[PDB]
Amino acid sequence: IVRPVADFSPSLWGDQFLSFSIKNQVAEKYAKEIEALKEQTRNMLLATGMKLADTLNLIDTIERLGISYHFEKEIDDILDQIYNQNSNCNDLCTSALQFRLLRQHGFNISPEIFSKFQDENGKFKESLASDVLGLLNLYEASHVRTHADDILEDALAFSTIHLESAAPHLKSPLREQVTHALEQCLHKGVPRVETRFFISSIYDKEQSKNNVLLRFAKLDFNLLQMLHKQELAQVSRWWKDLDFVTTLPYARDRVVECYFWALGVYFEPQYSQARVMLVKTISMISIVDDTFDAYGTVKELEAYTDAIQRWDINEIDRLPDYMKISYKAILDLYKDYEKELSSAGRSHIVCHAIERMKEVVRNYNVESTWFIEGYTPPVSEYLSNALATTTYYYLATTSYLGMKSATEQDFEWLSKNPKILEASVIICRVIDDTATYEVEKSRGQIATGIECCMRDYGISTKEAMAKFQNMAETAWKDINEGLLRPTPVSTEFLTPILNLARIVEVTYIHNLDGYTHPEKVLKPHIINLLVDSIKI
Template identity: 60%
Template sequence: MKNNPVNCDQQGIIRPVANFSPSLWGDLFTSCSVDHSQVPECYAKEIDILKEKVRRMIVANDKKLQEKLILIDTIERLGLSYHFEKEIQEQLQLTFNGYFKLENDQENDDLFVTALQFRLLRQHAFDAPSCIFDKFTDNNGKFKENLKGDIKGLLSLYEASHLRYHGEAILDEGLIFSTTHLESIDNSSTFMGRQVRHALEQSLQRGIPRIEAHNFIAFYEEDESKDESLLRLAKLDFNLLQMLHKKELYEITRWWKELDLVSKLSYARDRVVECYFWTLGVYFEPQYSRARVMLAKTIAMISIIDDTYDSYGTLDELAIFTDAIERWDIKEIDKLPDYMKICYKALLDLYDHYDEELRQQGRSFALHYAKATMKEIIRSYNIEAKWFIEGYMPPFGDYMANGFITSTYYLLATTSFIGMNSATKEAFEWLMKKPKIQVANVTICRVIDDVATYEIEKKRGQTVTGIECYMNEYGVSEEEAMKEFNNIAENAWKDMNEEFVKIKDVSMEITKRIVNLARLIDVVYKHNQDGYTHPEKVLKPCINGLLVEYFKI
């Protein structure tokens, strides 16, 4: 349970007293002050001109491989690649096929270029071989000593190593080698030093693309070799998209305020802005506007339900609520306690609204999958609550099987698809089969969440945690259990990297959502902090950067 203090309600039932901090944001996002006419139109015209200029730069065939790779990487890091997906994919296909050649042996032995090429190819689902790093190792398979001073090369190797598969010992070694020597660099005041420090804090592969773009724009502005057209396009595009994102958040916060669940259900967390931030991590591009709104509302709703099961309801009440969700019929509402009626009606109303929207788009089939995963998570919440209230510690395997579902990531992956026009019935069917990439996704969510929340839950008397179950079953210490959970997460990342490249059943547009969900966990639970429940340190700066601050043009 999340709360220690208790009180006695009007029915004489002893319940926890909620002690979650209030929302950080007040009414900041409930007024939409953006001028949606002249300013975006002014931006849009210049953006179109600059986009055409950048498009010509990408497809120009007068560039060396190194120049081509740096250009593509810069465009991606600036958050602009969604404008040029076709062109970038075509250029990387040519690179993968060996169309572009390095000019001389010196470039061929350049660690920076080799690692950059490898990373870009794998990030775009090309199965680049890790043996290309063999030339940088000695007879013992260790990276050569003369690379220690190549900061640019080490940083490139560090980022590339985060895309490794199982069994790629050279990249396991590459990560250790690059991390060790980058951490020893004492020049954090320099431009390159600040980039190194940021990368060690947050690798590119596991970072949230929108946040990384925001950070890189600031870095790129200081780069003496910057392209002014690229920088201006990045700033204009970021600001224009931010206007759309604020408009969406306005819609969501108004909906949330009208529901008034926070005052009616005072035991629950008020985190609707953080819910919307989560959706920006999944997809920030303009074509996913409705998808973001639908996903954010679902996350806000499941957060309330989670707190109901985890922090408030009795076993009898939760059993009735679980059954009502299973039946999914407003007539069931009379069986529920008054506080649950509020939540139940809000949930059914929300999905009725989805149904109406999806029917208009000819995509009503998607709602079936959304409801199925909602029912699934409710059943698992009920099992978890029963374990805790009855003081039962399940076998670790049972805990994990149920915990994968209560992580919310089966639900959120499915819900992220419902507003995507490109998510066909086949894509949903593929996801329902729980493919390896999705299992890796929920594994990362489950174990990192468990590590981050363990100390707080232990202080509150929670015994049915993953760490406790593992310690109990395997007779290991807390430290050993924590270490194993981090190993499980690392192995899941390797699964994800490999599956992303090798999956052919669905498009990269689909699989990117799953990778992005995993990236959110790496950021939100950084340094074993629960950034969702306690957003002050972790998420507040991110939300300010993406939704409050803007770039001066």
């Protein structure tokens, strides 16, 4: 009664990440210079009597350079001031940038700021088609819409067609920046990824660049990268001493991709413990998913699911030997988390992630039951099960474990499935179903999202993929709305959820599974963030 056949590609990284020894004198030299550069930058920000457009461009540059996390208080104070002054007297470039920066920071600036750029019908004035910097900022702003912003319904299409038309004749690096924006907008990109591109491909090549900011940005990126590499080494060593590579050979060996995921959720040094905890969880639920999907028999998956609900080491012997391996590793991981959080008296919060894991596994087992039965549920029923199998309710909960400022009330909010979390989960689900529809269908999975959608509504695969694309668009508007003040918890606890949605977009770009097939999408990102330093 043997098993399915292995068709997963092995880790393409080998052991190149296993040991990283930080050049300590370089670290100290970088940090010492950064302190000086950080103060110079702080004073640029606090400079009295700057014009609106100059201020917004400064803040935008500091944000794209990846160093704004040093200046949360200064940037906030400035945007707040701009928000409350109501300055509606500018051109498209400044207005669109004003709108984007304020919305991204939760300031509900009215979309009426764009009325002066439109005709009697709410269509942008085509006379603006020759203003490339205006179009570019309009373009970026168009991705931050909520449901109250139908004034902007035309902004994406308008700016896109005219940027495409202008791009081939633009000077550099402007051309490269426009071309990049059309493939990957800023708001929906992974921050370290956009930062790496901006620093190296754009700002470094700008004639007008500020030398202080550029040097700051390069040193800071390379210094954080040393931390990230230590973290990945520590995590690679943990994964190695688990040895699932050989004892659980049916499973995807993707701990580096998992680290990239955790790095997407937060890159700052204060979230180091959080990242390390998170990547371990992603790594481990990856193992569980492959057990349900590519190895376990329905009888085996039943006992596994029940063992997880009971969550007791007593239960191991009801499981086949190969499931004993992962089950003990799972239980041990949570005992590790409890020990890690003990000194800060935050051990009790681990139970929130545990309950969310039980939920994921219940729904894995349902999904397997559906496959065995040849069942094509209605879309509503399909989603009631398949949203949790994204693991995103679970990963979001997990992202909070290592965040020292997360309180019980923050977990209570998250446990009620707030709308911002639900939208992030929906984006993951529908993008995944759109990308992986064809392959899963060939493997016989009749319970696949798009199939459900086709059979339920009586519509073609094309119309179904388009209906899913639209649920993703609706979900982004809900994310954007969920960031607006007053927020139900600190922005600190919203950003991970937003970042989870961004990682989806980036991994499944151009409709391909970038996690199962890392070489396409993830590999260049991993090399740019974790292998190659920015040349100084």
